[PDB]
């Protein structure tokens, strides 16, 4: 489903964050920005989802910077 699983804004014409494990974990950039600023940063769903293994995935610093802009 192509909309944010937090704010439920459609993501059909823009960019978003896609959890590598859970397909239904889509997040708009504002929602991703709120999770980054609050976390410090794992999956904005809070389920600390893992990589494509079991170690939980986290935003790279360059991804964090892109979202904040």
């Amino acid at each position: 489903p192509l909309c944010c699983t937090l704010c439920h804004e459609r993501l059909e014409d823009t960019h978003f964050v896609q959890c590598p494990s859970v397909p239904s974990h889509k997040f708009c950039f504002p929602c991703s920005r709120q999770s980054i600023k609050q976390q410090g940063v794992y999956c904005p769903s809070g389920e600390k989802c893992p990589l494509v293994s079991n170690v939980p995935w986290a935003f790279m610093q360059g991804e964090i910077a892109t979202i904040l802009a």
Binding site: T14, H15, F16, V17, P20, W57, F59, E63, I67
Partner: peptide, 7 residues
């Protein structure tokens, strides 16, 4: 790993 930022 691929970016979580998608379009």
């Amino acid at each position: 790993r691929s970016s979580v930022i998608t379009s």
